[PDB]
Amino acid sequence: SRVCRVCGNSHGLIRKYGLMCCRQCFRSNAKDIGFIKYR
Amino acid sequence: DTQVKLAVVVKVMGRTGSRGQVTQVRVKFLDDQNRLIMRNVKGPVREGDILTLLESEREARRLR
Amino acid sequence: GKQKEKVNNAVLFDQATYDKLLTEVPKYKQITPSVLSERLRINGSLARRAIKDLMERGLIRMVSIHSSQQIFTRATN
Amino acid sequence: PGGDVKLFNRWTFEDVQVSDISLNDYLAVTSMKHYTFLPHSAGRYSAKRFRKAQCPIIERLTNSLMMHGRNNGKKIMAVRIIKHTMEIIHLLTDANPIQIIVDAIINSGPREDATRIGSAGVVRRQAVDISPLRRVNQAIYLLTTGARESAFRNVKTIAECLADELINAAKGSSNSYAIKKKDEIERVAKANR
Amino acid sequence: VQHRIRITLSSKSVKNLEKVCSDLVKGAKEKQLKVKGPVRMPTKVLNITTRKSPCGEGTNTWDRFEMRVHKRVIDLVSSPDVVKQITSITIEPGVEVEVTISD
Amino acid sequence: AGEEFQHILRVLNTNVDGKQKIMFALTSIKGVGRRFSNIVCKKADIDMNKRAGELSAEEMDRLMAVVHNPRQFKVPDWFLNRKKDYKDGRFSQVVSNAVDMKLRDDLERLKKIRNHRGLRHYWGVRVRGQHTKTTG
Amino acid sequence: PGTVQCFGRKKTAVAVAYCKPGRGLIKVNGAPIELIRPEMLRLKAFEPILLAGRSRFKDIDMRIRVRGGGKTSQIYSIRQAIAKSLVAYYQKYVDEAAKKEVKEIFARYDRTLLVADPRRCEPKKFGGRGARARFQKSYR
Amino acid sequence: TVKDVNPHEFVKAYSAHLKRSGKMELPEWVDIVKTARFKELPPSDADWYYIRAASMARKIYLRQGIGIGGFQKIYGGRQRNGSRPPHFCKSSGAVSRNILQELQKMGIIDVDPKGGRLITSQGRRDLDQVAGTVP
RNA sequence: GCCGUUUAGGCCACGGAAGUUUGAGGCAAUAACAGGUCUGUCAUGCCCUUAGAUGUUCUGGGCCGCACGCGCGCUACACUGAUGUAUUCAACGAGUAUAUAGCCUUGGCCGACAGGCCCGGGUAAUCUUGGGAAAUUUCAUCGUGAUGGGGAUAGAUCAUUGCAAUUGUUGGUCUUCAACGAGGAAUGCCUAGUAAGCGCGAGUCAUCAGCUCGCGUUGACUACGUCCCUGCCCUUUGUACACACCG
Ligand SMILES: [Mg+2]
Ligand SMILES: [Mg+2]
Ligand SMILES: [Mg+2]
Ligand SMILES: [Mg+2]
Ligand SMILES: [Mg+2]
Ligand SMILES: [Mg+2]
Ligand SMILES: [Mg+2]
Ligand SMILES: [Mg+2]
Ligand SMILES: [Mg+2]
Ligand SMILES: [Mg+2]
Ligand SMILES: [Mg+2]
Ligand SMILES: [Mg+2]
Ligand SMILES: [Mg+2]
Ligand SMILES: [Zn+2]
What is the amino acid identity at position E71?
K
Q: Which helix (H) or strand (E) holds H25?
A: none
Contact of G105 with chain D, judged by CB distance below 8 Å, is answered with: no
Task: Quote the CA–CA distance of G14 and G73 in Å, as a whole number.
Answer: 9
Q: Do residue E50 and residue A26 have CB atoms under 8 angstroms apart?
A: yes
Question: How much distance in Å is there from the Cα of F132 to the middle of ligand 5?
Answer: 13
Question: Which chain D residues in 65-84 sit with Cβ < 7 A of strand I?
Answer: 65-78, 80-81
- Taking one residue from B and the other from D, the number of pairs with CB-CB distance under 8 angstroms is 84
Kindly report each contact of residues H19-26 with a partner whose C-beta sits within 8 Å and lies 24 or more positions away, as own/partner. Answer: H19/H47, H19/H50, H21/H106, H24/H102, H24/H105, H24/H106, H25/H102, H25/H105
Angstroms from D159 CA to nearest CA on chain C: 8
Query: Considering only CB atoms, which residues of chain G are within 8 Å of chain E?
Result: 126-127
Cα F107 vs. chain centroid, distance in angstroms?
Answer: 19
Residue count of chain B: 64
Nearest to B7 by CA among B44, B43, B47, B42: B47
A11 touches strand I (CB under 7 A): yes
CB E24 within 8 A of CB E74: yes
Beta partners for residue D113, in sequence order: D128
CB G103 within 8 A of CB G114: yes
Cis-peptide into E38, omega within 30 deg: yes
Beta partners for residue H79, in sequence order: H87
Task: Quote the CA–CA distance of D121 and D119 in Å, as a whole number.
Answer: 5
Task: Quote the CA–CA distance of E8 and E71 in Å, as a whole number.
Answer: 8
Question: How much distance in Å is there from the Cα of C66 to the middle of ligand 3?
Answer: 50
CA distances, D160 to each of D67, D80, H102 (Å): 17, 12, 47
Which chains neighbour H (Cβ–Cβ under 8 Å, 3 or more pairs)? Answer: F, G
Pairing of strands G5-9, G14-20: antiparallel
Question: How much distance in Å is there from the Cα of A12 to the middle of ligand 14?
Answer: 9
H11 touches strand I (CB under 7 A): yes
CA angle C38, C42, C47 (to 5 degrees): 50
Protein footprint on strand I: which nucleotides are under 7 Å from a CB?
Answer: 12, 17-18, 23-27, 35-37, 40-43, 64-76, 78-96, 105-115, 125, 129-130, 132-145, 147-148, 150-158, 166-177, 182, 188-200, 202-205, 209-228
CB D157 within 8 A of CB D80: no
Residue H121's Cβ-count burial label (10 Å; 0-12, 13-18, 19+) is exposed
Technique that determined the structure: cryo-EM
Contact of A24 with chain E, judged by CB distance below 8 Å, is answered with: yes
Residue F74: phi, psi to the nearest 5?
60, 20
Per the structure, the residue whose CA is closest to nucleotide I112 at C1' is: H33
Question: Which chain G residues in 68-127 sit with Cβ < 7 A of strand I?
Answer: 68-74, 115-127
Q: Where are the beta strands (DSSP E) in E1-103?
A: 5-11, 34-51, 62-77, 96-97, 100-101
DSSP string, chain C: --TTTTTTSTHIIIIIIIIISTTTTTTTSSS--HHHHHHHSS--SSSHHHHHHHHHHTTS------TT---------
CA angle F67, F91, F121 (to 5 degrees): 100
- The ligand whose atoms approach the alpha carbon of G126 most closely is 6
Kindly report each contact of residues D18-21 with a partner whose C-beta sits within 8 Å and lies 24 or more positions away, as own/partner. Answer: D18/D102, D18/D106, D19/D103, D19/D106, D20/B52, D20/D106, D21/B6, D21/B50
Task: Quote the CA–CA distance of E13 and F117 in Å, as a whole number.
Answer: 63
How many Cβ atoms sit within 10 Å of the Cβ of residue G77? 29
Residue partners of D187: CB distance under 8 A and separation at least 6: none
The overall longest dimension of chain F from CA atoms, in Å, is 60
H124 touches strand I (CB under 7 A): no
CB D168 within 8 A of CB D147: no
Chains C and F touch (3+ CB pairs under 8 A): yes
Angstroms from G109 CA to nearest CA on chain H: 30
Which chains neighbour E (Cβ–Cβ under 8 Å, 3 or more pairs)? Answer: A, G
DSSP state, residue D169 = H
Contact of D22 with chain B, judged by CB distance below 8 Å, is answered with: yes
Closest-approach residue (CA) in chain G for H5: G35
Resolution (A): 2.9
D190 three-class SS: helix
Instruction: Give the CA radius of gyration of chain B.
Output: 11
From chain E, the residues in CB contact with G127 under 8 A are 59-61
The binding site of D for Mg(2+) consists of 151, 154, 156
Distance F78 CA to I159 C1' (A): 14
Nearest to G85 by CA among G21, G22, G15, G4: G4
Instruction: Give the CA radius of gyration of chain C.
Output: 11
Distinct helix (H) and strand (E) counts, chain A: 1, 2
From chain E, the residues in CB contact with A19 under 8 A are 48
How many Cβ atoms sit within 10 Å of the Cβ of residue C68? 14
Question: How much distance in Å is there from the Cα of G135 to the middle of ligand 5?
Answer: 22
Q: Do residue A36 and residue E63 have CB atoms under 8 angstroms apart?
A: no
Beta partners for residue G23, in sequence order: none
CB B11 within 8 A of CB B34: no
Angle of helix F116-123 versus helix F96-113 axis, rounded to 10: 110
What is the amino acid identity at position D38?
L
Q: Name the H helices within chain D.
A: 57-63, 75-93, 97-107, 132-151, 158-171, 177-191
Residue D191: phi, psi to the nearest 5?
-65, -45
Across the interface, which of H28, H29, H41 has its CB nearest the CB of F38? H41
Distance D53 CA to I219 C1' (A): 19
Distance G128 CA to I190 C1' (A): 12
D164 three-class SS: helix
Distance A33 CA to I40 C1' (A): 19
Nearest to G64 by CA among G97, G43, G86: G86
